């Protein structure tokens, strides 16, 4: 399948409590492999997946320096953006950064992306062409002019289609036993009468990898997208994922409804019916 | 690996 490497950064100002909270996390697909936390004792980039452990001291020294540099940049940016929006010193504010690259099953570049946020809203985003920026407001428009002058776009693009995709390939090889595996979902169905004339039918998918999956309810053949309760794909905590979809069904008409399960790990798509 | 061409906003 296709794969992604993503870094997520959360910076939160703590007015009258000293330094802002800084949390950096690296993902290959939905697996966290590195962490930096300002409040942690180490003050190092730390491993969070077994396959990153085989990187030498130079890797950990370099990622520590560079994550600290991003921390320091965020510290400055919190001050500057507070200035741009003319906000008081007493209020807590959040900067969020996500950037990453996607490769196909052949390991080749598909796309790169970066989005920056202030207080849970779009601030500035790299455009699809990886050559220009979209600024959310006049504050971000000041940031855009600075990033244009610094040639930020050209340097970010070179990283996204160079270093990002190169190190994604390395990680995918080193951790292939987990990262490039496919575990099919173990499936079952539950039945919960809500009244004497209605019942919930819940379709379960457990222990599947990767996270991408399609749970679809159909009555007689017709898709029930509009009338399907669909929870977020959640982590089990053992390296696998879980999901369910539910339909409220008139009692004695359960046999009509069918749950379709599409997943990379399946030989053929599954079709499930109630007891 | 992290992006490292850091420009202040």
């Amino acid at each position, epitope marked *: 399948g296709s794969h992604s490497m993503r870094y997520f950064f959360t910076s939160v100002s703590r007015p009258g409590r*000293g*330094e802002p909270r800084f949390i950096a996390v690296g993902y290959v697909d939905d697996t966290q492999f590195v962490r930096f936390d300002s409040d942690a004792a180490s003050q190092r980039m730390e491993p969070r997946a077994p396959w990153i452990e085989q990187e030498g001291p130079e890797y950990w020294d*370099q990622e520590t*320096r*560079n994550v*600290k*540099a991003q921390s*320091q*940049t965020d*510290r*400055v940016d919190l*001050g500057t953006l507070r200035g741009y929006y003319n906000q008081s010193e007493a209020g807590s504010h959040t900067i969020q950064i996500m950037y990453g690259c996607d490769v196909g099953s052949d390991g080749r570049f598909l796309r790169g992306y970066r989005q920056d946020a202030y207080d849970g809203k779009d601030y500035i985003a790299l455009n699809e062409d990886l050559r220009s920026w979209t600024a959310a407001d006049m504050a971000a428009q000041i940031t855009k002019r600075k990033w244009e*002058a*610094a*040639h930020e776009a*050209e*340097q970010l693009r070179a*990283y996204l289609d160079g270093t990002c995709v190169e190190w994604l390939r390395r990680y995918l090889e080193n951790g292939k036993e987990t990262l490039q595996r496919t575990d099919p979902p173990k499936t079952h169905m539950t039945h919960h009468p809500i009244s004497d004339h209605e019942a919930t039918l819940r379709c379960w998918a457990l222990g599947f990898y990767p996270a991408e999956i399609t749970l679809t309810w159909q009555r007689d053949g017709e898709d029930q997208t509009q009338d399907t309760e669909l929870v977020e794909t959640r982590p089990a905590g053992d390296g696998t994922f879980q999901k369910w979809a539910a339909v409220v069904v008139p009692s004695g008409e359960e046999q009509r409804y069918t749950c379709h399960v599409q997943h990379e790990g399946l030989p053929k798509p599954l079709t499930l019916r109630w007891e | 690996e992290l992006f*490292s*061409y*850091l*420009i*202040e906003k």
Partner: T-cell receptor
Amino acid sequence: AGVTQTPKFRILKIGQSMTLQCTQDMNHNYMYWYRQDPGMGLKLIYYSVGAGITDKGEVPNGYNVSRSTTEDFPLRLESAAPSQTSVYFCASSETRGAPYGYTFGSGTRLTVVE
Amino acid sequence: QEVTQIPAALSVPEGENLVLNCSFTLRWIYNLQWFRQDPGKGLTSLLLIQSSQREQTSGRLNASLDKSSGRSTLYIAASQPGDSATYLCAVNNAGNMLTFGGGTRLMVKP
């Protein structure tokens, strides 16, 4: 004015304390302390990315800094050692990238004597 | 991730063109800088090459930048005794900040 660094020189007996002052009025968030031994390059001791934070450089041991204000980044030698005989350069920049380059002070020659 | 200058000392008869070598292992550099240092004195900026630039020229001074091979060469045309000084190569990146080579002591012999 740029970066003003005092004193320009100082002879100091082993175990005596000294503070090297460094001031800039350019509102630079970034300030740096380097040392340079004879026939060597500059080596970063300590840096500050703004008021209220300092961070260790390449050779921080035997040294202390502080940054209560944007203007000042003083370097303290608690107990002057023979190894601290060197020339010290303070510097500042508006950004990390410093496209106009660092602003350097004139330098401080410290000699540590028995 | 550091900066190196070989040779550490160069003796040249005046009028002769010469080269000073800089190599660095720093990645995603912001810029590379060449400094002049007279004995007992501070730093004088000669050239500052941005990441996006291949070279900078100032009179008899020309400096190249190859980010890929991690190299800069300072070309001094028609050298004069007044060129005699210590030449420091400095490379700036996010993780290491402005990082200095050991320098080359240039002696231009009259």
